């Protein structure tokens, strides 16, 4: 794999080491990338830091004969979770086209958060189309592992069910959604449909009914 996972507790200082150490004089760049968003330059020229980049991030200068290249993040936050790339240029290796391996930083000890659940019944417009879909929205929960189960009446349904893997929001809590695809006649066929989501031993269940 290209990924090296590394887990750090909240408020602690992370230590990250570039995959290959330099042979000679070096110029190291650090990139922070969160999958889906654009990469950011944390550090360039070993220790130099672009404006708008917090002081918490720092790099080791290669003073004197040599220094190991490491990235230090002081007081890591949940928003520091991300993939870190060390771009290493030295005098004995030549042009480095590869960004190298990515260090995936996982931050632990974040407090537990119960999910907020909203369930939407099939719209009138959809029913007119001879399509019915039930939308269950799960948000603001931590950690990221949830179990979603759908019921027609009191009986479970596994058919036409599509669920996303939970992913982090801007606020650092997880969000996910589940979709139950039904024929309109099937929707009208039951007194109610329920979205049962289970998080950390507890359950939040929502219900809708034909009107």
């Amino acid at each position: 794999s290209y990924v090296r996972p590394l887990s750090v507790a909240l408020g602690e200082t992370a230590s990250i080491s570039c995959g290959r150490q330099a042979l000679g004089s070096r110029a190291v760049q650090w990139y922070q990338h969160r999958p889906g968003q654009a990469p950011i330059l944390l550090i360039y020229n070993n220790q130099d830091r672009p404006s708008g980049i917090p002081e918490r991030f720092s790099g080791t200068p290669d003073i004197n004969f040599g220094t190991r290249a490491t990235l230090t993040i002081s007081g890591v936050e949940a928003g520091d979770e991300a993939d870190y790339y060390c771009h290493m240029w030295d005098s004995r290796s030549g042009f480095s086209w590869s960004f190298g391996g990515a260090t995936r930083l996982t931050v632990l000890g974040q407090p537990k958060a119960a999910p907020s659940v909203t369930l939407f019944p099939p719209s009138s417009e959809e029913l007119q189309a001879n399509k019915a879909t039930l939308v269950c929205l799960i948000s603001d929960f931590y950690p990221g592992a949830v179990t979603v189960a759908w019921k027609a009446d009191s009986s479970p349904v596994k058919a036409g069910v599509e669920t996303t893997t939970p992913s982090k929001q801007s606020n650092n809590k997880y969000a996910a959604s589940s979709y139950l695809s039904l024929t309109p006649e099937q929707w009208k066929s039951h007194k109610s449909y329920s979205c049962q989501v289970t998080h950390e031993g507890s359950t939040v269940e929502k219900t809708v009914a034909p009107t």
């Binding site: 290209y2 990924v3 000679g24 004089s25 070096r26 110029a27 760049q29 990139y31 990338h33 999958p35 889906g36 654009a38 990469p39 950011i40 330059l41 360039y44 020229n45 672009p50 790339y85 771009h87 240029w89 030295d90 005098s91 030549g94 480095s96 086209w97 590869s98 960004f99 190298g100 391996g101 990515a102 909203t118 939407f120 719209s123 417009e125 959809e126 189309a129 879909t133 939308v135 929205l137 948000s139 599509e162 669920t163 996303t164 992913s167 929001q169 969000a175 996910a176 959604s177 979709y179």
Partner: protein, 232 residues
């Protein structure tokens, strides 16, 4: 104060040519080195190549012979073309300004030095999916608010965007007027291979009858723009 915005097809058929465009605003194109980077789901950031202020381009030997990077001064935009693509080529493509640094460990005479490049400014990037399949516009259905009452003057109101390919879909409310309560969820990939997502905003209960809520859905690949009005 350069600002970078990418543009792409969204979908490329296999064996055809992939073309993306980076729109540069507020700075001249000529003044900067320029480069393209792509990220693939199972793979790390990949460096495609760069073009100098002198119009000199160096490409990655891995993508060499399939790539052209070019500069258009008149439109102040940069270009990247990828010949004879395959599924390996499905990635998010970023354009970024580049800086060149020289580190001399010896004497400049005798060439005891080496250049290094780093990217200060990045664009949002553009998603490109390489597929045999045709682009499909999404169908937009409103998600009606419950109406009263929840003992907090909030109700959940949204729009369902269904069965579109490929990614991505951009959703806004009231023409970008309302941002406060909006949550747009990540899409789900169905057995069909189409994607669906939903955008939901939290609004007061009292407003619902008289207030205006319209979800603006943009699917550039399709290319479909649908505005749907949501009512209780």
């Amino acid at each position: 104060q350069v600002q970078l915005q990418e543009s792409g097809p969204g979908l490329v058929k296999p064996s055809e040519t992939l073309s993306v465009t980076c729109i540069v605003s507020g700075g001249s194109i000529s003044n900067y080195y320029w480069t393209w980077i792509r990220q693939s789901p199972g793979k790390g950031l990949e460096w495609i190549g760069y073009i100098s202020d002198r119009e000199t381009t160096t490409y990655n030997p891995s993508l060499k012979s399939r790539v052209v990077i070019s500069r258009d001064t008149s439109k102040n935009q940069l270009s990247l073309k990828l010949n004879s693509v395959t599924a390996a080529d499905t990635a998010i493509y970023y354009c970024a300004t580049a800086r060149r640094g020289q580190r001399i460990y010896g004497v400049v005479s005798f060439g005891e030095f080496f250049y290094y490049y780093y990217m200060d400014v990045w664009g949002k990037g553009t998603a490109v999916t390489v597929s045999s399949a045709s682009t499909k516009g999404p169908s937009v259905f409103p998600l009606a608010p419950s109406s009263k009452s929840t003992s907090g003057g909030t109700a959940a109101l949204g729009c369902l965007v269904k069965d579109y390919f490929p990614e991505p879909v951009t959703v806004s409310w009231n023409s970008g007027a309302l941002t406060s309560g909006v949550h747009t969820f990540p899409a789900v990939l169905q057995s069909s291979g189409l994607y669906s997502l939903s955008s939901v905003v939290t609004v007061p209960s009292s407003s619902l009858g008289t207030q205006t809520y319209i979800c603006n859905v943009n699917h550039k690949p399709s290319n479909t723009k649908v505005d749907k009005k949501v009512e209780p």
